[PDB]
Design an enzyme around this catalytic site. Sequence first.
Site, short mmCIF file in Angstrom:
data_model
loop_
_atom_site.label_atom_id
_atom_site.label_comp_id
_atom_site.label_asym_id
_atom_site.label_seq_id
_atom_site.Cartn_x
_atom_site.Cartn_y
_atom_site.Cartn_z
N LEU A 1 1.38 3.61 -2.14
CA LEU A 1 1.00 4.83 -2.81
C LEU A 1 0.07 5.68 -1.95
O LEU A 1 -0.34 6.78 -2.41
CB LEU A 1 0.39 4.54 -4.17
CG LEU A 1 1.38 3.98 -5.16
CD1 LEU A 1 0.62 3.65 -6.44
CD2 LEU A 1 2.54 4.96 -5.39
N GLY A 2 -0.32 5.19 -0.79
CA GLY A 2 -0.98 6.12 0.15
C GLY A 2 0.03 7.18 0.62
O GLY A 2 1.27 7.12 0.38
N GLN A 3 -0.48 8.23 1.26
CA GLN A 3 0.44 9.34 1.70
C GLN A 3 1.47 8.83 2.71
O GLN A 3 2.70 9.02 2.55
CB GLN A 3 -0.30 10.55 2.24
CG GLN A 3 0.61 11.76 2.35
CD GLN A 3 1.24 12.16 1.03
OE1 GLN A 3 0.52 12.44 0.02
NE2 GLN A 3 2.59 12.26 1.01
N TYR B 1 -14.85 1.84 8.01
CA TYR B 1 -13.38 1.90 8.19
C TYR B 1 -13.03 1.56 9.65
O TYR B 1 -12.24 0.69 9.93
CB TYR B 1 -12.80 3.25 7.84
CG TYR B 1 -11.30 3.45 8.01
CD1 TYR B 1 -10.38 2.50 7.57
CD2 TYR B 1 -10.77 4.60 8.58
CE1 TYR B 1 -8.99 2.71 7.72
CE2 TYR B 1 -9.43 4.85 8.62
CZ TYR B 1 -8.52 3.86 8.23
OH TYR B 1 -7.15 4.04 8.31
N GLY C 1 0.76 -1.23 0.00
CA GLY C 1 0.00 0.00 0.00
C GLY C 1 0.80 1.29 0.00
O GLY C 1 0.44 2.33 0.62
N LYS D 1 -11.10 -1.76 11.41
CA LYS D 1 -9.87 -1.61 12.14
C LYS D 1 -10.01 -2.11 13.57
O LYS D 1 -8.99 -2.59 14.10
CB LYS D 1 -9.40 -0.18 12.05
CG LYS D 1 -8.88 0.17 10.66
CD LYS D 1 -7.66 -0.68 10.22
CE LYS D 1 -6.94 -0.21 8.95
NZ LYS D 1 -5.64 -0.89 8.71
N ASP E 1 2.46 -1.58 -4.50
CA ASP E 1 1.07 -1.10 -4.55
C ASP E 1 0.32 -1.81 -5.66
O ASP E 1 0.95 -2.36 -6.56
CB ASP E 1 1.05 0.41 -4.81
CG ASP E 1 -0.21 1.06 -4.34
OD1 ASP E 1 -1.19 1.14 -5.15
OD2 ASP E 1 -0.24 1.50 -3.17
#
Length: 321
Positions: free
Chosen positions: A11-13, A144, A9, A148, A35
């Site tokens: 390419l998330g910030q 979300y 993952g 989690k 990614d």
Amino acid sequence: HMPRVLVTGALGQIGTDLSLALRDKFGADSVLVSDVVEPGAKHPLAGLKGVEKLDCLDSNGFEKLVKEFKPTWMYHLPAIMSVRGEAEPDLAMDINVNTTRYALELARKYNIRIFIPSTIAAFGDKCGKTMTKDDTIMNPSTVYGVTKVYTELLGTWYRQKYGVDFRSVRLPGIISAATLPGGGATDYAIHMYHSALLQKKCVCPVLPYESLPMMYMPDTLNSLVKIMEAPLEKLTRTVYNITGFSFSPSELRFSIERCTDRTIEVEYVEGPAQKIANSWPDSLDDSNARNDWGHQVKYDIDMMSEDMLRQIPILHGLPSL
């Protein structure tokens, strides 16, 4: 020994800035970043060796990569966050639940120290929203957050049952100058910086006194590396709150006014983020993180604002101050 680190993952910030920080600290040869798609043309990861396409929804492909690379650490970062996931819950479950399932089984099978982030979205309105504790009632109002809570618990069971070295933090709002703002739950903050540089009115969708726990990204990166370096014997838990400082939109406005020496025009028109943000903590108790592994932060709100107002022009082309 130094670690061999897999990031999924990327390419998330968080995944991008963390990928770069890990390459810088450990060397590109020791980090493999992946990614589901390729980086965009101007993305910081574009054209770098050690950046690959991996679909973590394909458990056999995920395994193949882990078997070949032989990571000692994994940062499993794919995520569909609050606002997006309310409209795309099936994808949110795929990404937030099924890829985590696979990641934890791989961590068990291949003896990997595995980081999977949680979030303040794991909390809801029964949490106790002043200095929220690490252990409290979890009644998240977004899918979300729902996903989690399950990740926290499942990772912790993998630790208990198999000895998997599972680690996690509950990320607060994460502010970065690189963020391209849209309709995200915390994006008001980024919009307000942009409006100030543009010298335009900001219509803020979060109400003026709605406080949230926040962190500036440099501090987040430091903590994400520190928790993974810590000796296992020092960790009293698997999942830790971490915070920088709390602010509301009215407090951010004043910070920006101090740093620009200008009046900033803000009007408040509630949008979807407000209902979500009002269900989250106002502030977090992060004492367990501080004591167990030395979580610390360098930035306060004005230091953050001075750096944001410098960096946004550089990264996005907006007028300088």
